[PDB]
Amino acid sequence: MRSDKELKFLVVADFSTMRRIVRNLLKELGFNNVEEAEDGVDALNKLQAGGYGFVISDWNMPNMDGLELLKTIRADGAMSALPVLMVTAEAKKENIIAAAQAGASGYVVKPFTAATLEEKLNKIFEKLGM
Template structure:
């Protein structure tokens, strides 16, 4: 399973990569924003995208919409990570078929629980 972590903050990106590896997910890629993520997705098979919601260039919500609008990519589950618990943003992401949410700050147990939920679906 190949997981793409999309996060503009290098520290948070490395924390998520470390957590994923701790949980046994060794095949991970990283992108700094939605545009970079789409470049990587076009070049390799990605099984799960974990993206921050708020990023420059292309945010996580636009990335989610772009993935779900493309018939070649729509099968890829997208998990959203955000510090913004705004119900309107969460409802918009749910309507765009987000697979799951993680609210920052989170711990290893929270990530593991969400991964199990998303990968079961």
């Protein structure tokens, strides 16, 4: 429905190209309420204003990385409920375990196709009920 398509996303990544790819895939899926941030600090400044419903973060970023962003989110009372999808690089399963242990709603490995992202997004929406 139009209503659920209203879910507000925050895409967090140092690389503009990455933010562009994700933002287009979201648009292909019908989600137009998308915002961007370039590091963990910029993201927290936007999240604290509230009213966000889903966060997608890349892993390596300056100032505050993705893992650190995730722990910060999970430790904040008002934010601990946010669904958070972590993007990680291949050859780094340690990153996958780390994200699971920190409370990531899910992870997606890059590069990823339009199909994979949707696949992971849908799995998350079932678990939390959306």
